[PDB]
């Protein structure tokens, strides 16, 4: 079926200090897609959990849930100068055939760009 | 004892309910055509898929996520065989293609992949385990060499 990964890369600008409330919001947006199924993606409201982190979110694209999630990120990312968010889209069939080493890094390099805020 | 303990209890219980429902809605998002409700073993298959990077742990072949619930495509195997370990813990459960889980029998991964002579298949298997998202106690369990004996 239409399985895709939304490769999300979150980094800190330095253009502006990041609030603790802004961190708690982003971590909350991410954890809405986190369960026992993919606990490794879990985010905390700390700098180590959000700065320079790649997160590959699995979606069935025939569902609108991927669009919802990306919209929540884009909406957030535009009301927060301190955090940059980049998003790519990649086939799951291409994702699993990538190496495991630096996989999310290579997915962003070979994935289709969605936005860079 | 107290009422504020009661409130914390339903606070904590809500987080438990919300997470189990989060995993349930995700499962039917991935598989709309999945008839019925995802059982624990179905969630485990999906969980194992993510931790093994979409690869069959024994063959290294890519698992088609679409056929995950297809009866007779992917199986949950006891790495260290249940007959010699009685280990039904999550640490001893791995995801493999049904085709590749036909000739292992009662062997450990170490025995099956001829790790005694450090074979290529052993090295590839070991590399697949150490690079997975398994806990480090799960990797150790899977990669066990000798037993009690």
From TrEMBL, chain B:
Transmembrane segments: none annotated. It comes from the Bacteria. The active site is at residue 78. Monomer. Binds crRNA and tracrRNA. Belongs to the CRISPR-associated Cas9 family. CRISPR (clustered regularly interspaced short palindromic repeat) is an adaptive immune system that provides protection against mobile genetic elements (viruses, transposable elements and conjugative plasmids). CRISPR clusters contain spacers, sequences complementary to antecedent mobile elements, and target invading nucleic acids. CRISPR clusters are transcribed and processed into CRISPR RNA (crRNA). In type II CRISPR systems correct processing of pre-crRNA requires a trans-encoded small RNA (tracrRNA), endogenous ribonuclease 3 (rnc) and this protein. Has 2 endonuclease domains. The discontinuous RuvC-like domain cleaves the target DNA noncomplementary to crRNA while the HNH nuclease domain cleaves the target DNA complementary to crRNA. This is CRISPR-associated endonuclease Cas9. The lineage of its organism: Bacteria, Pseudomonadati, Pseudomonadota, Betaproteobacteria, Neisseriales. The gene is cas9.
